[PDB]
């Protein structure tokens, strides 16, 4: 993808591959719901929206001519389709077990394509460091498990298993995850809030995006109210973190991580 001014990205993981190094995307898919559920690293102003990931506006991207064009693997249009239209590129967010160690093989990935392999291992190496460092804010912690969640609609909760993004930042702190249940290849399931109510003593974190009208309507239900670890004091909502992102949304999960239970 040789001019690194006209890359395209049409999903939100490949968004976070080209800024973690250094690369400003000349059109991004979204950037509207990019702010609501990723936010943390921010796009600047200049980005075009190409519309939204599943469905882009292919006459824009047309006219655009974009050197490069990246995606997500198994989301969103026809790669077929897509690489009719310029160059590009899928990037897996997971093998369906370990996102994170996909994450860093994606970085590397997209900076060979992009000469900036250098950049690719400045950042890695930020990334490890951060991590390990912040190991001893969750030591006085013990070995209660955490459920994270986010909210879907009022009748529904997304919640993040053991392949989910999330995981293995809760093994390297200790942190047992509650949801041992199934998922699916991105690491998560939607559930019924009544299946919520066989957990008592963990803590529950929820991811917010600006749905304060869903987390009210559900939090005024009889059932949330009686939800023991909402009884229990164990429930906080905490600031949106991309579920499906690669190493700047798991370090962006450590900083909310942290806040919430360090």
């Given at each position: 993808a040789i001019d690194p001014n006209r890359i395209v990205a049409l999903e939100w993981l490949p968004v976070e591959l080209l800024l973690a190094l250094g690369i400003v995307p000349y059109g991004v898919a979204d950037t509207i719901n990019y702010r609501l559920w990723?936010?943390?690293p921010p796009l600047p102003d200049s980005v075009i929206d190409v519309g939204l990931?599943?469905?882009?506006n292919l006459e824009l991207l047309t006219e655009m001519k974009p050197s490069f064009m990246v995606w997500s693997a198994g989301y969103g249009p026809s790669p077929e389709m897509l690489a009719r239209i310029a160059p590009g590129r899928g990037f897996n967010?997971?093998?369906?077990?370990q996102p994170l160690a996909m994450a860093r093989k994606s970085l590397t990935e997209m900076a060979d394509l992009l000469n900036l392999q250098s950049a690719a291992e400045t950042h890695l190496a930020q990334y490890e460091d951060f991590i390990r460092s912040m190991k001893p804010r969750f030591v006085?912690?013990?070995?209660r498990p955490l459920l994270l969640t986010t909210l879907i609609d009022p009748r529904h909760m997304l919640v993040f298993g053991p392949?989910?993004?999330?995981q293995e930042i809760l093994d390297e702190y200790g942190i047992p995850n509650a949801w041992q249940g199934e998922t699916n290849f991105w690491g998560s399931t939607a559930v019924s809030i009544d299946r919520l109510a066989a957990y008592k003593d963990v803590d529950v974190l929820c991811f917010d995006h600006d749905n304060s009208k869903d987390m009210d309507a559900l939090m005024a239900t009889p059932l949330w109210q009686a939800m023991p670890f909402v009884r229990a004091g164990r429930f906080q909502r905490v600031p949106a973190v991309?579920?499906?992102?690669a190493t700047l949304s798991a370090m962006h999960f450590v900083r909310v991580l942290d806040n919430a239970i360090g």
């Open positions: 990723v936010s943390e990931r599943t469905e882009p967010f997971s093998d369906g077990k006085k912690r013990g070995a392949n989910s993004l999330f991309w579920f499906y992102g």
